[PDB]
DNA sequence: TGTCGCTAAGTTCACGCAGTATCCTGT
């Protein structure tokens, strides 16, 4: 996989919670710990190399007015062991969707989180309609959400964004969904 | 008809015998020719109890004050009204006796008419907070039997005692040879101007081996040597030892080399073998009524001898337990509690003489154990069997002689050093200057002897003292010292017993300090007559005055010298102790606004003295809240002298009573820090020869707490600061002693003695919190563990730092000598002795001298400068 | 069952404060 198609997916492939956090990322180029581990996971999981992920968390991070020596002090390490190059070395999986909802809660300064779960529906609201979403389709992901079904909601998203009726597949890990979104599109 | 004796201890029971004190001592018989032991029974000794009449009737505390005056005819008629019959009081005896009182007790006229009011012991006793509608207070409602008889009678410790009309005792009560009986305390009266007698003082050793399977104390050998005249107004007798008695106890498991029969016969024929302990506990009671001592004396006697003859008493139910006293009585005192009042009481009658706690008060040495002792006074050797060496000591008739042999020794070692530090006279001065009981003077402790020396000054004297009870203050002052090394001549001036002549002169009396119940209370009136407390002080201050001058006379001993040194340090501990008793919180006659009053007028003094030095326009570098130290500018000794007397007489010629003398001349000084210097004081011999003597006075080398090693290396660096040698050539011996003995530690060529550190537990092992393992603690716990004598507290404890593995912090290795001497996986902590133990002692040390520092010294010593 | 006072330097431990380094989480 390539780094400059990263910003491809993000904009159709990405999840929202990987949009919210990549959007994040290339508003402030900087995040923190939990968002960090949450896409490091996800960018290991559709198939980012540790050389290209060291690549883009360097350039990214760069640009938040810090060293690029202190990045090599202090990321560098956790970058190697989020790819299990370290200590235990484990090949950590990534976060699924159940995780991302019962993990870390986010508060004020974060970004992530499935934004189903931890968007006010207001805010949910206000995403989707961004997202040129139909109305009907927005209200049904609302009524969803507030069913407490958040991967019913995202199923519906994908559904709505895919322009397929039925997803066809049981959405529990972001990694599917990425890898259902690339199998329709390529 | 009279009968006159000299008594020296009294023994009471207030729950057995009720309004009954023993008295025992000696008394003269001409068909003996000889001075034997009696005990006379002052019975009847009447309760008595001073009422304090009200100004003013008082409704039952409920009306309050009505108005109604009340006079001694209404007091009395109160008590036998309401007070006699609601406490079932039949008989007394009723008077009034205008008394003063001054003590901390709110609201109680300075002098009134109190009404005393005199009933049998054995009818029930008053409560103290007993009030009534006519009187506001009940006093000396628990006043014991002996301290009335004591106090009333006017007896002042031991003296001779006549006696009018004795009654012969219908039936034995004790076991001496003569028994009288005292109708009434007022027939018994004090001779003046008389020769103490000589007694009989038995010094015992024991030696005992631990039960296994019972984990408990038996006795194995018992060895005993009594005196029969030694003196207490004399020098000590030579030979101090006149006979003795020796006795063996088989083990109950081991048996004789079938030899022990023949070494016996052909060694003596004093020594007593027993097949049981029984047998020998038996022996032991038999001998010790035969001679009947007066004066029993051994080591740790309090602590662990008497206790445990006592418990195997108990233990192997030998018969007439009794005898160990002087007293018949038929139920032991219950064992245990704390201090050794219950194995005090277990002997009475017989004074008891614990010489660690006699050397304790007296001398100060590193530690304690008999083995120190021993070495320290006398000069000697002292052999210690191992405990292992004991138990199967019993295979050699040899080594089973040879035992005994030791714990002969042992015993004749305990009665040179008590014939050497003067214990008996000592004691026996001290108590009569006081007015206690001596078997309680000789068992330590400064409150009981000040409480009954102020008892009696206010007895004496128509006072009421108060009833027995059933940092704080501003102290000293230091001056900031101006740290550094002085060759010219520091010139020292101190005061003679500071806090007495402060008492004596500002009138700081009991009777004249007008309390209040954290302030300073105001100075007395000029006005007002000596109190009693300055008239107290004033005779002990006197006593030392004299024996002190006494000292001055020239060509004397030697040892009478050692011996006029540690009375006249006796005598000032005691002046400073009546001082000290003013700020106890438990004393009798706690004082604290006194107390506060004498050190602030110490501060005072000592400022102003420092503001006077320093307007003679001279230098002032050190004082510790009596002395100043001047620095002179100056190098001959004639200009010092003078300097001196002037300075003296100027500073003296604003007091009234105190004086400042030459507390002594400095050649070199060197101050490291408050309360910590060395110098080379000077002594006049004659035609302006001065020698020179090398005095440290709170240094790191004169502490038990720092390794041998240290102490040697500091005492030849300070030896060689301190000397007159040029500054290069010091510091070239300096580097070079230093490499030597960096070279020698690393060699191991130091021998191992060297090596311990030293300190005191506080508490026993068990009671010290769990605080991690400070090291001392850690090694009494393994003794402890061990199969050998325990270490209880207040006793100074050795152990060595070694090196096993551990990994863990230097504090947790701390281990015993015996065990590295045993343990063969075990060795010295090189890095750590010459890094914290050696480093810092130098560093300290030559710290204000310029061309050494830390750095210089780790790297001399051989250590890695790195951490340095 | 009583075991004198205060003052002061000194050791060993327990913690703030800041700085450096390594090691984590999942399915
Ligand atoms: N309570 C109490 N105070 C003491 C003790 N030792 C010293 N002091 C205080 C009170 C003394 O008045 C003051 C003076 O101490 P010194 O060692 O100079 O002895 P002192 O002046 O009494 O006599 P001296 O210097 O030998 O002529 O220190 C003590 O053991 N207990
Ligand atoms: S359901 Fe899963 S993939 Fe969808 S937004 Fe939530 S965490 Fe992301
Ligand atoms: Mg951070
Ligand atoms: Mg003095």
């Given at each position: 996989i390539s780094l400059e198609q990263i910003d491809g997916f993000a904009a159709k492939s990405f999840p929202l919670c990987m949009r919210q956090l990549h959007k994040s990322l290339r508003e402030n180029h900087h995040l923190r710990h939990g968002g960090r581990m949450q896409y490091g996971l996800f960018l290991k999981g559709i198939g980012l190399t540790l050389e290209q992920a060291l690549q883009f968390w360097r350039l990214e991070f760069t640009?938040?007015?810090?060293?690029s020596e202190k990045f090599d002090k202090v990321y560098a390490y956790s970058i190697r062991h989020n790819y299990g190059?370290?200590?235990?070395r484990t090949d950590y999986t990534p976060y699924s969707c159940m995780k991302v909802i019962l993990s870390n809660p986010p508060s004020q300064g974060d970004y992530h989180g499935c934004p189903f779960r931890h968007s006010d529906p207001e805010l949910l609201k206000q995403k989707l309609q961004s997202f040129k979403v139909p109305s009907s389709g927005i209200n049904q992901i609302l009524e969803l959400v507030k069913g407490m079904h958040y991967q019913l909601a995202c199923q519906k998203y994908f559904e709505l964004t895919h322009s397929?009726?039925?997803?066809?597949?049981?959405?529990?890990h972001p990694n599917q969904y990425f890898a259902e979104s690339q199998k329709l599109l390529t | 008809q009279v009968f006159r004796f000299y008594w020296l201890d009294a023994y009471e029971d207030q729950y057995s015998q009720p309004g009954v004190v023993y008295l025992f001592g000696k008394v003269w018989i001409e068909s003996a020719d000889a001075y034997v032991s009696c005990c006379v029974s002052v019975k009847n000794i009447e309760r008595t109890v001073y009422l304090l009449p009200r100004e003013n009737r008082v409704?039952?505390?409920?009306?309050?004050?009505?108005?109604a005056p009340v006079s001694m005819m209404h007091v009395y008629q109160e008590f036998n009204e309401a007070v006699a019959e609601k406490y079932k009081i039949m008989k007394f005896k009723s008077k009034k006796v205008d008394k003063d009182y001054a003590f901390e007790?709110?609201?109680?006229?300075?002098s009134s008419e109190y009404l005393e009011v005199r009933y049998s012991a054995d009818s029930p006793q008053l409560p103290q907070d007993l009030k009534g509608e006519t009187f506001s207070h009940v006093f000396?409602?628990?006043?014991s039997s002996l301290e009335l008889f004591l106090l009333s009678r006017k007896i002042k410790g031991p003296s001779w005692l006549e006696i009018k009309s004795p009654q012969l005792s219908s039936?034995?009560?004790?076991?001496?040879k003569v028994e009288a009986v005292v109708t009434?305390?007022?027939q018994v009266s004090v001779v003046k101007d008389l020769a103490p007698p000589p007694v009989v003082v038995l010094s015992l050793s024991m030696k005992t081996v631990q039960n296994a399977k019972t984990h408990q104390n038996e006795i194995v050998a018992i060895a005993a040597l009594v005196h029969h005249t030694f003196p207490?107004?004399?020098?000590?007798?030579?030979?101090?030892?006149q006979t003795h008695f020796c006795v063996l106890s088989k083990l109950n498991d081991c048996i004789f080399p079938y030899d022990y029969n023949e070494a016996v016969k052909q060694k003596n024929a004093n020594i007593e073998i027993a097949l049981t302990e029984r047998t020998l506990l038996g022996f032991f009671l038999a001998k010790i009524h035969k001679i009947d001592p007066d004066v029993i004396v051994g080591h740790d006697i309090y602590g662990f001898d008497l206790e445990v003859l006592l418990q195997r008493i108990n233990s192997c139910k030998v018969?007439?337990?009794?005898?160990?006293?002087?007293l018949r009585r038929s139920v032991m005192p219950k064992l245990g509690?704390?201090?050794?009042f219950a194995e005090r009481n277990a002997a009475c009658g017989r004074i008891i003489c614990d010489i660690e706690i006699s050397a304790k008060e007296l001398i100060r040495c590193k530690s304690y154990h008999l083995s120190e002792l021993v070495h320290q006074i006398l000069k000697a050797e002292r052999v210690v069997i191992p405990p292992e060496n004991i138990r199967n000591a019993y295979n050699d008739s040899v080594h089973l002689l040879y035992m005994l042999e030791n714990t002969w020794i042992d015993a004749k070692f305990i009665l040179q050093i008590m014939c050497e530090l003067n214990v008996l006279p000592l004691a026996l001065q001290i108590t009569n200057i006081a007015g206690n009981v001596m078997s309680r003077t000789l068992m330590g402790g400064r409150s009981e002897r000040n409480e009954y020396l102020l008892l009696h000054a206010f007895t004496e004297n128509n006072f009421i003292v108060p009833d027995k009870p059933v940092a704080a203050y501003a102290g000293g002052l230091v001056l900031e010292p101006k740290v550094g090394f002085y060759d010219k001549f520091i010139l020292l001036l101190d005061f003679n017993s500071l806090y007495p002549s402060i008492i004596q002169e500002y009138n700081i009396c009991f009777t004249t300090v007008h309390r209040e119940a954290d302030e300073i209370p105001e100075l007395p009136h000029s006005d007002l007559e000596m109190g009693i407390l300055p008239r107290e002080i004033r005779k002990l201050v006197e006593r030392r005055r004299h024996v002190k001058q006494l000292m001055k006379?020239?060509?004397?001993?030697p040892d009478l010298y050692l011996q006029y040194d540690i009375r006249q340090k006796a005598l000032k501990l005691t002046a400073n102790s009546m001082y000290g008793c003013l700020g106890?919180?438990?004393?009798?006659?706690?004082?604290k606004p006194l107390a506060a009053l004498v050190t602030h007028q110490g501060r005072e003094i000592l400022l102003h003295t420092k503001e006077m030095v320093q307007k003679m326009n001279l230098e002032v570098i050190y004082g510790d809240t009596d002395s100043i130290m001047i620095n002179?500018?100056?190098?001959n000794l004639e200009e010092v002298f003078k300097l001196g007397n002037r300075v003296k007489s100027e500073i003296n010629k604003?007091?009234?009573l105190l004086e400042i003398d030459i507390d002594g001349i400095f050649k070199s000084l060197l101050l490291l820090k408050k309360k910590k210097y060395a110098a080379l004081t000077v002594e006049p011999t004659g035609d302006g020869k001065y020698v020179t003597k090398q005095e440290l006075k709170g240094?790191?080398?004169?502490?038990?707490?720092?390794?041998e090693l240290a102490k040697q290396a500091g005492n030849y660096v300070i030896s060689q600061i301190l000397s007159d040698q040029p500054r290069d050539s010091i510091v070239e011996n300096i580097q070079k002693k230093l490499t030597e003995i960096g070279e020698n530690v690393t060699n191991g060529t130091?021998?191992?003695?060297?090596?311990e550190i030293n300190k005191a537990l506080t508490k026993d092992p068990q009671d010290y919190?769990?605080?991690?393992?400070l090291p001392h603690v850690h090694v009494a716990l393994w003794i402890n563990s061990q199969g050998g004598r325990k270490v209880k507290a207040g006793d100074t404890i050795s152990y060595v730092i070694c090196q096993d593995?551990?990994?863990?912090?230097?504090?947790?290795?701390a281990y015993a000598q015996e065990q590295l001497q045993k343990q063969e996986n075990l060795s010295i902590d090189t890095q750590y002795y010459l890094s914290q133990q050696v480093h810092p002692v130098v560093a300290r040390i030559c710290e204000?001298?310029?061309?050494?520092d830390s750095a210089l010294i780790a790297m001399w010593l051989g250590l890695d400068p790195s951490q340095f």
């Amino acid at each position: 996989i390539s780094l400059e198609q990263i910003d491809g997916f993000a904009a159709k492939s990405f999840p929202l919670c990987m949009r919210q956090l990549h959007k994040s990322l290339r508003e402030n180029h900087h995040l923190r710990h939990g968002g960090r581990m949450q896409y490091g996971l996800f960018l290991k999981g559709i198939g980012l190399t540790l050389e290209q992920a060291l690549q883009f968390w360097r350039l990214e991070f760069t640009k938040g007015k810090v060293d690029s020596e202190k990045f090599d002090k202090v990321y560098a390490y956790s970058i190697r062991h989020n790819y299990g190059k370290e200590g235990k070395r484990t090949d950590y999986t990534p976060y699924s969707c159940m995780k991302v909802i019962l993990s870390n809660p986010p508060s004020q300064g974060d970004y992530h989180g499935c934004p189903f779960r931890h968007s006010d529906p207001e805010l949910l609201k206000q995403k989707l309609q961004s997202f040129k979403v139909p109305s009907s389709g927005i209200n049904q992901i609302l009524e969803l959400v507030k069913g407490m079904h958040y991967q019913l909601a995202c199923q519906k998203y994908f559904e709505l964004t895919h322009s397929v009726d039925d997803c066809g597949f049981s959405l529990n890990h972001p990694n599917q969904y990425f890898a259902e979104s690339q199998k329709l599109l390529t | 008809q009279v009968f006159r004796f000299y008594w020296l201890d009294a023994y009471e029971d207030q729950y057995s015998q009720p309004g009954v004190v023993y008295l025992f001592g000696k008394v003269w018989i001409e068909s003996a020719d000889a001075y034997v032991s009696c005990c006379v029974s002052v019975k009847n000794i009447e309760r008595t109890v001073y009422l304090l009449p009200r100004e003013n009737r008082v409704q039952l505390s409920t009306g309050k004050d009505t108005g109604a005056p009340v006079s001694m005819m209404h007091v009395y008629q109160e008590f036998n009204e309401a007070v006699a019959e609601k406490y079932k009081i039949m008989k007394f005896k009723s008077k009034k006796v205008d008394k003063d009182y001054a003590f901390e007790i709110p609201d109680v006229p300075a002098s009134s008419e109190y009404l005393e009011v005199r009933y049998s012991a054995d009818s029930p006793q008053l409560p103290q907070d007993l009030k009534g509608e006519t009187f506001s207070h009940v006093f000396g409602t628990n006043t014991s039997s002996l301290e009335l008889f004591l106090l009333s009678r006017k007896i002042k410790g031991p003296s001779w005692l006549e006696i009018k009309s004795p009654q012969l005792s219908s039936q034995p009560m004790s076991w001496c040879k003569v028994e009288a009986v005292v109708t009434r305390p007022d027939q018994v009266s004090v001779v003046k101007d008389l020769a103490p007698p000589p007694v009989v003082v038995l010094s015992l050793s024991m030696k005992t081996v631990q039960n296994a399977k019972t984990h408990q104390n038996e006795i194995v050998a018992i060895a005993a040597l009594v005196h029969h005249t030694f003196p207490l107004d004399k020098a000590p007798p030579q030979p101090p030892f006149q006979t003795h008695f020796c006795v063996l106890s088989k083990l109950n498991d081991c048996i004789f080399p079938y030899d022990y029969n023949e070494a016996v016969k052909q060694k003596n024929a004093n020594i007593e073998i027993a097949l049981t302990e029984r047998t020998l506990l038996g022996f032991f009671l038999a001998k010790i009524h035969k001679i009947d001592p007066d004066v029993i004396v051994g080591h740790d006697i309090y602590g662990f001898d008497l206790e445990v003859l006592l418990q195997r008493i108990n233990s192997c139910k030998v018969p007439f337990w009794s005898k160990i006293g002087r007293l018949r009585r038929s139920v032991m005192p219950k064992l245990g509690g704390r201090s050794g009042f219950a194995e005090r009481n277990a002997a009475c009658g017989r004074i008891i003489c614990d010489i660690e706690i006699s050397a304790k008060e007296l001398i100060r040495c590193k530690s304690y154990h008999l083995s120190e002792l021993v070495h320290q006074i006398l000069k000697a050797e002292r052999v210690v069997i191992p405990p292992e060496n004991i138990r199967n000591a019993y295979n050699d008739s040899v080594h089973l002689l040879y035992m005994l042999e030791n714990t002969w020794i042992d015993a004749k070692f305990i009665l040179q050093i008590m014939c050497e530090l003067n214990v008996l006279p000592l004691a026996l001065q001290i108590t009569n200057i006081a007015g206690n009981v001596m078997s309680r003077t000789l068992m330590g402790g400064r409150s009981e002897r000040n409480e009954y020396l102020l008892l009696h000054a206010f007895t004496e004297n128509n006072f009421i003292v108060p009833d027995k009870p059933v940092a704080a203050y501003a102290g000293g002052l230091v001056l900031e010292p101006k740290v550094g090394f002085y060759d010219k001549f520091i010139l020292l001036l101190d005061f003679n017993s500071l806090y007495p002549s402060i008492i004596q002169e500002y009138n700081i009396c009991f009777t004249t300090v007008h309390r209040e119940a954290d302030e300073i209370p105001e100075l007395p009136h000029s006005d007002l007559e000596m109190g009693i407390l300055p008239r107290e002080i004033r005779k002990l201050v006197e006593r030392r005055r004299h024996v002190k001058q006494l000292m001055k006379q020239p060509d004397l001993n030697p040892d009478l010298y050692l011996q006029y040194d540690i009375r006249q340090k006796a005598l000032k501990l005691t002046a400073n102790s009546m001082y000290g008793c003013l700020g106890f919180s438990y004393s009798r006659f706690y004082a604290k606004p006194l107390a506060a009053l004498v050190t602030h007028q110490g501060r005072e003094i000592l400022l102003h003295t420092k503001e006077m030095v320093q307007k003679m326009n001279l230098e002032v570098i050190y004082g510790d809240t009596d002395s100043i130290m001047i620095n002179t500018n100056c190098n001959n000794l004639e200009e010092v002298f003078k300097l001196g007397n002037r300075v003296k007489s100027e500073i003296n010629k604003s007091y009234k009573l105190l004086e400042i003398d030459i507390d002594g001349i400095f050649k070199s000084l060197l101050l490291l820090k408050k309360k910590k210097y060395a110098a080379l004081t000077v002594e006049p011999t004659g035609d302006g020869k001065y020698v020179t003597k090398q005095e440290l006075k709170g240094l790191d080398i004169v502490r038990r707490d720092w390794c041998e090693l240290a102490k040697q290396a500091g005492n030849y660096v300070i030896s060689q600061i301190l000397s007159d040698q040029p500054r290069d050539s010091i510091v070239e011996n300096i580097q070079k002693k230093l490499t030597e003995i960096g070279e020698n530690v690393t060699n191991g060529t130091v021998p191992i003695t060297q090596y311990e550190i030293n300190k005191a537990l506080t508490k026993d092992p068990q009671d010290y919190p769990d605080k991690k393992s400070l090291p001392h603690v850690h090694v009494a716990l393994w003794i402890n563990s061990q199969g050998g004598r325990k270490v209880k507290a207040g006793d100074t404890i050795s152990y060595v730092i070694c090196q096993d593995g551990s990994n863990l912090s230097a504090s947790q290795r701390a281990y015993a000598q015996e065990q590295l001497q045993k343990q063969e996986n075990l060795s010295i902590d090189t890095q750590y002795y010459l890094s914290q133990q050696v480093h810092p002692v130098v560093a300290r040390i030559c710290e204000p001298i310029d061309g050494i520092d830390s750095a210089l010294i780790a790297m001399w010593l051989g250590l890695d400068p790195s951490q340095f």
